[PDB]
Symmetry: C3
Subunit: 296 residues, 3 copies
Amino acid sequence: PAGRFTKVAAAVADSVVTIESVSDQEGMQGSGVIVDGRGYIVTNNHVISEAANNPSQFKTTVVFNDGKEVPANLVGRDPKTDLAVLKVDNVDNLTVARLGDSSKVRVGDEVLAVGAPLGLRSTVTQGIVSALHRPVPLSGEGSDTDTVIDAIQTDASINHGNSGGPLIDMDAQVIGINTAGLGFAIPVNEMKLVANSLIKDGAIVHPTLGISTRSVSNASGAQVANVKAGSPAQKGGILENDVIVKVGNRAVADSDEFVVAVRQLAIGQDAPIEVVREGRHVTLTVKPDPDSTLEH
Amino acid sequence: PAGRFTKVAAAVADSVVTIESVSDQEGMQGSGVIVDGRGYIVTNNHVISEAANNPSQFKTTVVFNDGKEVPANLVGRDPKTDLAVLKVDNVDNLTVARLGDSSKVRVGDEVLAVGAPLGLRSTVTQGIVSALHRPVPLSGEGSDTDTVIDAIQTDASINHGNSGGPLIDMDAQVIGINTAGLGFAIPVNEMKLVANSLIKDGAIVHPTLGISTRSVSNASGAQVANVKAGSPAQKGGILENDVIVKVGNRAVADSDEFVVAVRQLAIGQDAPIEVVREGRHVTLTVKPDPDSTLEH
Amino acid sequence: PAGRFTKVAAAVADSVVTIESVSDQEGMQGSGVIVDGRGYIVTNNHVISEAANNPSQFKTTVVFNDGKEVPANLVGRDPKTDLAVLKVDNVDNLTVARLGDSSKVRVGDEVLAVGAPLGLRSTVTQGIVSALHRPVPLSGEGSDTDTVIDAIQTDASINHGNSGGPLIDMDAQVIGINTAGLGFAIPVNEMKLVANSLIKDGAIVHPTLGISTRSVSNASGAQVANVKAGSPAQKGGILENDVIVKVGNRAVADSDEFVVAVRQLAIGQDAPIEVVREGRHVTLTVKPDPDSTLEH
């Protein structure tokens, strides 16, 4: 008579792996999920960040459920979503995870934050979804720039032991990727989009406006702190100490939501930015650039 | 096929509101619960504390489930129980919460700490009741005096995102009011009593003895640290460095339980205080005063 | 209609007790579990540590569910497993706990961390098993030496309010002993072995090698930091800055697992220690001594 969560955790264990990167004097471990039978594995960008930035000195391996250790190669990574894709070569009989639909997730849904069973300090935690589409700032691990993501929030503990592993619903389906870098997960629908671009192109392109903001709240939004020269914001009329309240069709509550809303804009297409300037309600038009132009 | 907690959270969402108070350079947000069809809303005293103390510069609104924003007026507040009552005027088709009975709550009962779905960093957390009638100290927000309450304790996370919202049982009934100011909730039976007095009178009166205590434990209770001149304690013979072990019919383990026990006394009626004085077991009689005499 | 966890917590409440040790100017409280009808109670070593080290000034009592207070005497204690056994004399109609089998516990199993209902800040928390056989360091309370144990890890909160109490499965059976000294419990199968030796002999004997280690991880294990003179390690050839990777038949990931693995060796019997010495893979033979020779 195995328990409710015991069954679900056991049903996905074969699909979760330990990811380990080591040099002469450093060792760095995480979890990941098998998402493609050819050997493609999804994890956090901060789990592999140092191996990616120092690939000549770091070696990355994958440890499966049975204990097999296999070399692993970095397909691509996205620090802006704290996502990354690895690939193991010609491994047979892989248990691929079942990818859910994070758009159907609801507050109160019971979830499991599953870490790799063989990880050093591995954890499997249980809780509910506490919030949806919740912008959360994430600290960049190495030279990686900090970022903000629309996260699924859960009161299941997200820690080093299950970071990079899957957030699992009661149907044993992946609805998110745990990120410890009061718990947060990268929703699986964004995960599928980012991993598709990383698998095909080895990188991903996100829109940018050249804006840096700080949060403001009074009788509220993202206050423009710096506008880059020649940027879409500078060419659109966005001024400094403007208070951004809407980017595209998304209302902006603070600096966190501003970062997320910008990534939802269309590159190369006009878009409205609603601001409040010295008390006045002003709307501006910006054409977002790609953040990496030679990959666009 | 919606989940166990998903159903309960969704069934009470229409009854939980976002409470927001703003000035020229300040913004303060919380949650509340609709408890009366005329428009009466219960929240924490620390959610509104600054608007109450600076009403000329702060404006308070209520945001409902559908997104409606409505002005809100402070009916009354009790810092000693960290409770407060707001009122929205002539709002139709209000979903009033179902108030449970906190005296029937038991350790192990599954609960939800529900925050306002539209709050900025809103949360809905899940856990069990971890303790009943647990005295807990609460820090006063502004110039508000600190206090202690008989709390329902839960291992559901109580945070800024669900503070002021309801603690909900598996029957979708309110058994407490969350207070973040390891989680604690104001039991609903005390909530009904305090809100009734605040709705009728705009304030509430609690008994007082003129005693300040610190906790002591050895081969134990509340040690009298200061007795106000002319107080019921001073007129009853209570001395300094007395160790209070019983107030009324309630045993007193420490300073926290002493504060709570005093509030359970009858105003204007004799009551026994059992103390241990230089090793001796002494009982004293005190007649508690109202803490605000012109409202009694 | 009592809840799922409400029933289980209520079914074991009569078997959990408050343990309290007091002097002239100190007071120290914990929880324990009744494991034998003659009056034998199991708790943490850090709950009673100061009464054990200063028995002339500390007095220890047990408070049952109904409220009975009874003197308690220390049978034995093991700081290396943070376990201890008390005994109440000639108490009738004791509700003895049902001891489960921690070897059958699985990740995801629903558990309750039950504290003594009458304890000052007692808690009952709920969660799942997050990891099995997880080495965790524990800080010694008084002059007690720090230690490491193979723990059951749970995301049920382990705190002062339930430390020393039982970790309870959904069959109301004890699978571990809570230790607060992200939660950890002493598995019940080790608990039965340690308590048997403490009840019979008033103490327990654990193997030792004379090794102190620090953790290392690179392209990994316990690095030998100090070898005692004349120790089994010194007589076996173990050198300083050796990197221990296997003790007996147990792989050793870090210093935590090394401590635990040593306690699983046979006293007086040869055993292999696999090390990596200046790049070379070397195996050594050691004969573990008893840590207390006159009790062996």
